[PDB]
Amino acid sequence: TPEEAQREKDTRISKKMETMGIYFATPEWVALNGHRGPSPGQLKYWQNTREIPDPNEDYLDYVHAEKSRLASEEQILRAATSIYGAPGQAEPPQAFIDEVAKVYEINHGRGPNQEQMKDLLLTAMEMKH
Amino acid sequence: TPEEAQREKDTRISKKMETMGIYFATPEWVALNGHRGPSPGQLKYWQNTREIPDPNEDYLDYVHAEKSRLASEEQILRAATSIYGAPGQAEPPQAFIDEVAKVYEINHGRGPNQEQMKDLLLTAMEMKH
């Protein structure tokens, strides 16, 4: 049956997308999108806004806009650990990881500039002393 | 001696500021600032940029600009736990807290809008199933 062959296909495409962490791409989202995975614009709209892309929108302005930087809590922790510099490279205090987190928020997902790096290094030195 | 009385005063003001998590306000920063804590503009410049305010700048544009929203990792975890809704209210998977983190970065420290809330709720439901 072309119906079951259609449900399996949507399920297959959706599984592929979610394995990559593309969470909006459910089998129903994929059905609505004409039984195909997201176009470049749909992916980049989602990546940059975290809103579910309309299956019936193409997002042509997000196909060739390229800012797009964001940090997970792992990335934030690796940045904070590098800046803090504790012996045996142990985790920084939570108060420090929070200042680093807020820097990534201020910068829309980008990492600390030079001036911010100085603030963070100043902060780290007070917390170790 | 007015010198020791000056060092104690700077130390006193600085201790007060750092107890509040105002980390740039070292005793040396306080000395340079004419032996006073930060003005409203200096605090708000720091809060909104995370750069050490110049002791010899007043930051008049930051005295009456009021966006200023930011989230610690505690706030992010409380938002993620509320949205995820696991029994006994146990911590969400790290992959979920990371999607919530990235939403706060996209929004410059503000919390998820309605469209983003839908994405996150969709995400939570896939991770529990």
Q: What is the dihedral of CA B10, B11, B14, B15, to 10 degrees?
A: -150
CB contact under 8 A, B26 and A105: no
Calculate the CA B24 to chain-centre distance.
13
- Which chain A residues have a beta carbon less than 8 Å from that of B105? 70-71, 104-105, 108-109
CATH superfamily label, B1-70: Capsid protein VP3, domain 1 (1.10.150.620)
Q: How was this structure determined?
A: X-ray
Which class is A71-129 in CATH? mainly alpha
Q: How many CB pairs under 8 A join A and B?
A: 114
The 10 Å Cβ neighbour count of residue B42 is: 24
Q: Where are the domains of chain A?
A: 1-70, 71-129
Residue B38 in contact with residue B25, Cβ under 8 Å?
A: yes
Tell me if B34 sits within 8 A of B42, measured CB to CB: no
Q: Provide CB contacts within 8 A for A72, sequence distance 6+.
A: B98, B101, B102
**A89: Cβ–Cβ under 8 A, 6 or more apart, which residues?**
A81
Distance CA(A31)–CA(B79), nearest Å, equals 31
CB-count exposure of residue A67 (10 Å: 0-12, 13-18, 19+): exposed
Element (H, E) at A77: helix A73-84
Cβ within 8 Å, pair A21-B95: yes
Instruction: Give the resolution in Å.
Output: 2.3
